[PDB]
Amino acid sequence: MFEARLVQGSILKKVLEALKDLINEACWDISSSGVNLQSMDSSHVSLVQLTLRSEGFDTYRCDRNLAMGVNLTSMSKILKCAGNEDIITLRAEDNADTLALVFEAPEKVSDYEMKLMDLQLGIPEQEYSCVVKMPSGEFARICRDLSHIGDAVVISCGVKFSASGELGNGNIKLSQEAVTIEMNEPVQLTFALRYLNFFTKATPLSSTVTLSMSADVPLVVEYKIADMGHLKYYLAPKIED
């Protein structure tokens, strides 16, 4: 039997708004330490790692670990029925065919049962040659803007984001609310803006975002969820033929 009460239910709403358009079916790893979700996107170019630590919940209980296969869109739909200031409680039993979502308004209580599905990849140890901390909104604006220019962004790290298409090209230069760069080596990597634009759907989770880079390894776009944990996207690079 698992039960997690969250008073800032908006967090879970924002989380699933961030994931629904990138992963169809994903397994939620529920443990005593908290909720874990790790899933490739449907395109097999990225890896999402979500961590909500038990501490971040207002009450949290998980007698035995449980892996709930979840259709993220259906869970998205159910969470759109939660008031943006509702108290969300998650509730599962062992061998559950169903995850219970209870939305308490601060005299309306909504009880949802979501049918669970029956449903692998390891994150290596990596020192990142370059790590960029910047406002999440600015990063989303960059990846939105450059997608009008091209399909690919070359990230050069001062960090430069450059795209080119038929109409021309664009270079966006940020240097050091704040933007900070820890650079142990200069890196230049190319990534599909389409997937970075999926990642920035997590922008409501945090005012800032961190981009971790290293030569010829996946890019890490990390959105920390204040207190609870984080939402991490790893994006396989584009490589020159």
Binding site: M40, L121, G122, P218, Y234, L235, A236, K238, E240
Partner: peptide, 13 residues
Amino acid sequence: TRQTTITSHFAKG
């Protein structure tokens, strides 16, 4: 330039 799969970078146990 060509997109690569995340599984061509990350592995399983």
